């Protein structure tokens, strides 16, 4: 019954990364209003959110690759870490353009984030049918 | 096997409503960015699409919390009920001030916003944990 345990975190590490990785973008989005409204205080607490919660989902996305161990996890467990650098980087970008107080520039590294995010979507659906899969089949 | 299929279909609804609602207001803050910029054709689009995934999610939390007999399960179900109840109404204000283009208006309820999804957030793996005891209680 260890097994299963395991194969449940290794659930609950893809579903918390996931979640708080699309939290940090909208914090630094939030940053931005912030900041065009006269609070940069405000707006420097919204960034440190979401440097904090990108940080935190990276360190689930790297325990997850760590603790897979199964073949048919490993290949798209390397393709999550590497996508997840992507959507990093551009989350990176928009609290760059934050900095620049460029809007235009935002937006393209915005529109960076979700094309980086619906891949890592894609991805966390493989993943999450490859660990149930995995669990029903120790219990049958 | 049918009652380990119908906790599986359990939290399928509640990680796919917790992965559209945060989307949802995601779509609401990057729409506001986008209508300062003056980009308001694509705002309008995010507003389209925060209402639609709000619909839907708000769809999903309702079917798992009426399918959520279990006694273990009733008490953490309603807790998610009453958070995301207040979680779509701090979206709708979101969504209500970026419409009315409100610096004002969008700084009330964008803090009751993204403290609710922490929260949703935390009751989501509290509900898994507790589903995924009942399913290997078999």
Redo the contacts between chains.
Sequence with gaps: ?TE?DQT?HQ??RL??A???A??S???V??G???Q??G?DESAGKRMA?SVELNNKSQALVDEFVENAREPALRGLATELQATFAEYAKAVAGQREATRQRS??Q??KV?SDAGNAMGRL?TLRQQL?TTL?ERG?QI?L
Excluded: C, K, P, T
């Design positions: 019954i299963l449940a659930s609950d579903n918390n996931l979640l708080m699309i939290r973008s909208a914090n989005s939030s931005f209003i912030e065009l409204g609070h959110l809007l235009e935002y937006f915005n979507q999450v149930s029903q219990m």
